[PDB]
Amino acid sequence: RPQPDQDLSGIVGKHLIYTYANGWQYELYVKNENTIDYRIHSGPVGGRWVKDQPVVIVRLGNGMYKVSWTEPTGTCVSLVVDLAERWLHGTIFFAQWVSQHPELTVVFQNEHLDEMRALRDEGPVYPQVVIDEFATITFVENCGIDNDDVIDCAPGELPDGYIDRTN
Amino acid sequence: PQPDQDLSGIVGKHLIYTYANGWQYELYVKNENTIDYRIHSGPVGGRWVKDQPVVIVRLGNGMYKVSWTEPTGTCVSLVVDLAERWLHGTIFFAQWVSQHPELTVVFQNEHLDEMRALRDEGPVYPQVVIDEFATITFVENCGIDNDDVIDCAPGELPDGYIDRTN
């Protein structure tokens, strides 16, 4: 009864666009074994985007990966990504203050890390608000490792049909 | 093409598992959205919980995700593979739990207010994150809403209970 092989070559370099069952459109790029960039297009935190988010990735089975991390806002995330079947499951544990004021996290976070930690330390943190939703993966491409051009602007500054592309 | 969300393959399941760091945990899926659990070893060995609200989804054949938050502020997301007898755990705990794990070693149901006081006191940040694979050493079906599966402290169990295999 072996635990699955931990080769991550099937996930690193992957760039995906996905729509949660509640309509929220998210974007992910797996920069390397332990780093992602992401960009949020709609829902309460549409406009939020992040580079060089440290992440822990494990392989669950064929084309199936788990991606988990914590954010400077205090938010915790664990994703299950099925590339083969083109779906994803997201658990987002956000702090109470992020639930109350999602607008305050709508930034290029890399230019505002101190502000995020100030809002986090101010709270309130508890109780945490939990989102569990399935998403459809509408788009997948391979952009290779450590490519800083994949996610390099606010979602508002992209062409209008960028988020709507399919394969 | 998202997977069918029939949870009958996970509800009623009772499992004992050992993380790669040797920590022995025990889980009972009481119903679609509730677990009891009992921790036997590692920093919070002695801790046990009844009627933990939980969100469960089916990922594939014999593969389930179980996620919840605790009155301590701890967040948990498990991937359970019953077919291949392994489990992957992500545990996000507050700085104060990392510093004083002994303070969470209780029958939590009799100490909910104390846990929330310790949580609101902090410190909270940075969070400490555990990602570990576990081997599932034992599985049985105990059916739905069975309050007898996990009804005492791990210290009060028969000596061979956590060592059984199948």
Numbering used by the authors:
A (entry chain B): 24 to 190
B (entry chain A): 25 to 190
Which sentences did the original study use to describe this structure?
Enzymatic decarboxylation of biobased hydroxycinnamic acids gives access to phenolic styrenes for adhesive production. To date, several PADs have been biochemically analyzed and structurally characterized. PADs adopt the lipocalin fold, and the core of the protein is formed by two mutually perpendicular β-sheets. In solution, a homodimer is formed by two monomers that are related by an improper 2-fold axis. In this study, we used ancestral sequence reconstruction to generate thermostable decarboxylases.
To gain a better understanding based on their activity and stability, we determined the structures of N31, N55, and N134 via X-ray crystallography. The models for the remaining ancestors were predicted using AlphaFold 2.41 N31, N55, and N134 were crystallized with one, two, and three homodimers in the asymmetric unit at a resolution of 3.1, 1.6, and 2.5 Å, respectively. For a given PAD, the monomers were found to be highly similar to a root-mean-square deviation (RMSD) of below 0.3 if aligned. Also, the overall structures of the PADs were found to be conserved, leading to an RMSD below 1 Å if aligned to BsPAD. The highest structural divergence was found in the C- and N-terminal regions. The C-terminal part (depicted in red) shows some structural and sequential diversity. N55 and N134 harbor an N-terminal loop (depicted in blue) absent in N31 and BsPAD that contributes to some extent to the dimerization (compare also Figure S4). All ancestors showed a highly conserved active site architecture with identical catalytic machinery.
